[PDB]
Amino acid sequence: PRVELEIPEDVDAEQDHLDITVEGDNGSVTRRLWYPDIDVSVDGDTVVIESDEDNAKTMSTIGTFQSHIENMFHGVTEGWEYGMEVFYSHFPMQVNVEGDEVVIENFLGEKAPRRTTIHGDTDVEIDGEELTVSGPDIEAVGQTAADIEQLTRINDKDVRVFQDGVYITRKP
Amino acid sequence: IPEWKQEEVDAIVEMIESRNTLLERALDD
Amino acid sequence: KPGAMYRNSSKPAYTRREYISGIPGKKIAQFDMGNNGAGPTYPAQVELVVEKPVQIRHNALEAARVAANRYVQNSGAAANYKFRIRKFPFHVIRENKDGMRAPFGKPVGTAARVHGANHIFIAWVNPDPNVEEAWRRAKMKVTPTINIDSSPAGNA
Amino acid sequence: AEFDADVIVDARDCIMGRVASQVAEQALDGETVAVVNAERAVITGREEQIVEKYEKRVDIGNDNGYFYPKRPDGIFKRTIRGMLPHKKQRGREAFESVRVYLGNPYDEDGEVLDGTSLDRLSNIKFVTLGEISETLGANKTW
RNA sequence: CGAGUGGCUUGCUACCUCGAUGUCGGUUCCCUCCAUCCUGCCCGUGCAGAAGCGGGCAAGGGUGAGGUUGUUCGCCUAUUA
RNA sequence: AGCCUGUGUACCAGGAGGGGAACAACCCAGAGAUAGGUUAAGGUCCCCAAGUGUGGAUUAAGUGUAAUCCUCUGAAGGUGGUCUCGAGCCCUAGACAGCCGGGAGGUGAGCUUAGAAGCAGCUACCCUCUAAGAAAAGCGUAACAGCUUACCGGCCGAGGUU
Numbered sequence: 001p002r003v004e005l006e007i008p009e010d011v012d013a014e015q016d017h018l019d020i021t022v023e024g025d026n027g028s029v030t031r032r033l034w035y036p037d038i039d040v041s042v043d044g045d046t047v048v049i050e051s052d053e054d055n056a057k058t059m060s061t062i063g064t065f066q067s068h069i070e071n072m073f074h075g076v077t078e079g080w081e082y083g084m085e086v087f088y089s090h091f092p093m094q095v096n097v098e099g100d101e102v103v104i105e106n107f108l109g110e111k112a113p114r115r116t117t118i119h120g121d122t123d124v125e126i127d128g129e130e131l132t133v134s135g136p137d138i139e140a141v142g143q144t145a146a147d148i149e150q151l152t153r154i155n156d157k158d159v160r161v162f163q164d165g166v167y168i169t170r171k172p
Numbered sequence: 173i174p175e176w177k178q179e180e181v182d183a184i185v186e187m188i189e190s191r192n193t194l195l196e197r198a199l200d201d
Numbered sequence: 202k203p204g205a206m207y208r209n210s211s212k213p214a215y216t217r218r219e220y221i222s223g224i225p226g227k228k229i230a231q232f233d234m235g236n237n238g239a240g241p242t243y244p245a246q247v248e249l250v251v252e253k254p255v256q257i258r259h260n261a262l263e264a265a266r267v268a269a270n271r272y273v274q275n276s277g278a279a280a281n282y283k284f285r286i287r288k289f290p291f292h293v294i295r296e297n298k299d300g301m302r303a304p305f306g307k308p309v310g311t312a313a314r315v316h317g318a319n320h321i322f323i324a325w326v327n328p329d330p331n332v333e334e335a336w337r338r339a340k341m342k343v344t345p346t347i348n349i350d351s352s353p354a355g356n357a
Numbered sequence: 358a359e360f361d362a363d364v365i366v367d368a369r370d371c372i373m374g375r376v377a378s379q380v381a382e383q384a385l386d387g388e389t390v391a392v393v394n395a396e397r398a399v400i401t402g403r404e405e406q407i408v409e410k411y412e413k414r415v416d417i418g419n420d421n422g423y424f425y426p427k428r429p430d431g432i433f434k435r436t437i438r439g440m441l442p443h444k445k446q447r448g449r450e451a452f453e454s455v456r457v458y459l460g461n462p463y464d465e466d467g468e469v470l471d472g473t474s475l476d477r478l479s480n481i482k483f484v485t486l487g488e489i490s491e492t493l494g495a496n497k498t499w
Numbered sequence: 500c501g502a503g504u505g506g507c508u509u510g511c512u513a514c515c516u517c518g519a520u521g522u523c524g525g526u527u528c529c530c531u532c533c534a535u536c537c538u539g540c541c542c543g544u545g546c547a548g549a550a551g552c553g554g555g556c557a558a559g560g561g562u563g564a565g566g567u568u569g570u571u572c573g574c575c576u577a578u579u580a
Numbered sequence: 581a582g583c584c585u586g587u588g589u590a591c592c593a594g595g596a597g598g599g600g601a602a603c604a605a606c607c608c609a610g611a612g613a614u615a616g617g618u619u620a621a622g623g624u625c626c627c628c629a630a631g632u633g634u635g636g637a638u639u640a641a642g643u644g645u646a647a648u649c650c651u652c653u654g655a656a657g658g659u660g661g662u663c664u665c666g667a668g669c670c671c672u673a674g675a676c677a678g679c680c681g682g683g684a685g686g687u688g689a690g691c692u693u694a695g696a697a698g699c700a701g702c703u704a705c706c707c708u709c710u711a712a713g714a715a716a717a718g719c720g721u722a723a724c725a726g727c728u729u730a731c732c733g734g735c736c737g738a739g740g741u742u
């Protein structure tokens with residue numbers, strides 16, 4: 001099998017060994033794409049993913065490499081953004097960006113601030129009760145958004161009653 | 173060889189006398 | 202008592218009631234189920250086939266049958282289908298319940314000997330195989346692994 | 358320090374067992390062998406089960422003792438010892454004329470033995486001795 | 500109803516010892532197993548909370564003092580995570 | 581039951597030597613001494629004599645590398661893990677999936693019921709417009725609304741489904 005991905009005019013993709021880097025006006029993302037007998041190479045205007053095997057396990061990874069690269073094309077141009085919404089019922093939750101990590105205070109009245117560290121070059125811009133997580137690396141942005149939501153996870157009590165927390169509102 | 177498709181290409185050609193593929197079909201007639 | 206004790210056919214056939222007394226009655230309630238008034242005049246005929254020669258205690262037959270027919274009530278108490286368990290527990294089984302002295306056991310029950318590939322159950326249905334399910338439940342209560350086989354039915 | 362090796366073998370990206378088997382055979386033939394870059398040697402399989410085995414060996418023991426090595430250094434040497442009758446005179450002589458090294462203290466670049474190399478491009482299920490030692494608690498002195 | 504795992508009980512067998520492998524219970528002192536009682540981290544709930552019930556990972560540590568009985572076991576009391 | 585008790589046979593007992601990690605009866609093998617040679621069972625990556633042998637395929641679990649067995653467990657049941665072979669049906673007159681749009685009126689059918697309007701229960705389930713559209717397959721409402729399946733059209737482009 002062999003798939004060809006025509007790279008966007010807006011982008012440049014280089015690759016040595018098992019590492020591929022994609023640069024665009026919005027940034028640059030480098031990934032490792034390592035799998036038995038799957039070659040990824042940059043043939044001028046198109047990135048090529050090929051292999052001499054067609055077994056199910058191989059086709060699975062080929063399809064995965066594809067979406068991974070296309071996702072990079074998108075991240076270096078249009079970019080990736082997740083929208084979030086802070087929400088509380090009794091205690092005013094305070095979500096601030098301090099350093100390279102987002103801090104949440106007064107969660108359910110908690111005295112101890114809850115926090116999490118942002119992944120890579122991901123921007124977490126907060127405006128009122130709305131958050132926007134963005135960047136060129138979907139992996140990083142996706143996790144940062146997720147971690148934020150996970151950060152308000154509660155297991156001790158009934159979630160249906162205690163719904164406070166920040167949640168992903170819009171997925172790219 | 174679906175028949176309903178064959179009949180449509182006819183009905184279409186009829187109204188042309190007095191799906192897109194079926195219209196383009198009739199037109200080819 | 203576990204089936205481990207009686208599922209094998211390693212003992213001589215022991216079925217002569219003229220020389221054996223005190224044989225417990227069978228727990229199997231019926232052998233003909235559904236519309237026994239009608240004859241196999243159905244489109245589809247599925248069978249539960251045993252895949253290994255084994256002994257099946259009347260205990261397992263009843264539970265297997267009930268679990269299948271009690272379920273075939275996805276069609277209704279007077280539904281249109283007929284169910285048949287073709288085997289009967291002829292083999293009398295003993296237990297040595299003194300130690301190994303004068304150990305010939307006393308009669309404790311009965312079992313049916315089924316050879317691999319025979320059909321123990323046969324159902325007759327119109328294209329409405331809920332019976333295929335009644336059997337997934339039936340071979341669940343008998344020792345052997347089983348094959349659910351359909352005969353008259355090219356309506357796939 | 359200073360080892361007149363008649364043969365210097367490079368273990369980088371090679372199957373530990375297949376190298377060991379050959380280094381054993383050669384030492385019993387009278388050759389003085391040195392295995393280089395032990396930390397970069399490799400063993401195929403699922404890292405999780407592989408590590409469980411070696412971890413079990415570390416935990417095994419008692420007063421009589423079962424000294425199992427943690428550094429890629431000894432792991433490899435013990436591996437070779439298992440392919441030699443190390444308690445017989447001949448066996449101990451051969452074993453003592455074999456030494457494993459972390460990295461390469463020599464000037465020459467060791468040679469790659471036939472049928473011991475692993476192609477990283479067609480293999481994903483394998484582990485580095487160095488990684489194993491790190492898991493075991495070894496002090497990454499390399 | 501069906502299929503199993505363990506080798507703590509009981510039974511079976513009679514392989515080992517009758518030129519003897521010192522009994523039950525207790526005690527003291529050491530190691531271990533997990534099918535987890537508590538503790539850690541979790542899932543479900545007929546999960547509002549609190550208090551629970553059930554389940555998963557998990558053997559690091561803990562799992563105590565007493566009244567009757569030779570008792571093992573077990574019954575009972577007050578403490579206890 | 582490494583149980584008890586028959587039977588036929590070969591073996592141990594009273595049977596070496598080779599193999600099986602060890603091991604009375606499993607495999608080869610029945611054996612004067614000494615010597616050269618070739619095989620048997622079994623084995624040829626190292627320990628360990630002989631292949632890191634050849635053509636091809638499967639397995640990712642260290643499954644497995646365990647003839648036989650007290651000794652080598654692993655079962656009923658389950659598996660869109662993966663490989664191979666077959667049959668039926670659909671498809672460039674554009675299939676399967678997804679996304680976008682349409683899902684219309686007589687009409688909120690009649691009946692019962694304050695009520696009931698696709699959807700409490702009962703009966704029926706007709707015809708119009710049309711390229712589609714149930715007298716409504718699933719939610720939802722006090723009943724409506726709202727959200728969707730069926731059904732049609734578009735985008736897309738190659739196999740898909742049982």
Ligand SMILES: [Cl-]
Nearest residue numbers: 418419422423
């Ligand atoms: Cl030790």
Ligand SMILES: [Cl-]
Nearest residue numbers: 442443444445
């Ligand atoms: Cl030795």
Ligand SMILES: [Cl-]
Nearest residue numbers: 036480481482
């Ligand atoms: Cl691999």
Ligand SMILES: [Cl-]
Nearest residue numbers: 595596610611
């Ligand atoms: Cl002889």
Ligand SMILES: [Cl-]
Nearest residue numbers: 406407410642
């Ligand atoms: Cl292993």
Ligand SMILES: [K+]
Nearest residue numbers: 516517519520
């Ligand atoms: K004795």
Ligand SMILES: [Mg+2]
Nearest residue numbers: 156157548549
């Ligand atoms: Mg609570």
Ligand SMILES: [Mg+2]
Nearest residue numbers: 516519520521
């Ligand atoms: Mg003594």
Ligand SMILES: [Mg+2]
Nearest residue numbers: 533534556557
């Ligand atoms: Mg456990």
Ligand SMILES: [Mg+2]
Nearest residue numbers: 531558559560
């Ligand atoms: Mg302990």
Ligand SMILES: [Mg+2]
Nearest residue numbers: 592593594604
């Ligand atoms: Mg004798």
Ligand SMILES: [Mg+2]
Nearest residue numbers: 382628629630
């Ligand atoms: Mg040799």
Ligand SMILES: [Mg+2]
Nearest residue numbers: 641642643644
């Ligand atoms: Mg194994």
Ligand SMILES: [Mg+2]
Nearest residue numbers: 647648649652
């Ligand atoms: Mg076997």
Ligand code: NA
Nearest residue numbers: 299300302303
């Ligand atoms: Na007696």
Ligand code: NA
Nearest residue numbers: 340343344345
């Ligand atoms: Na069964």
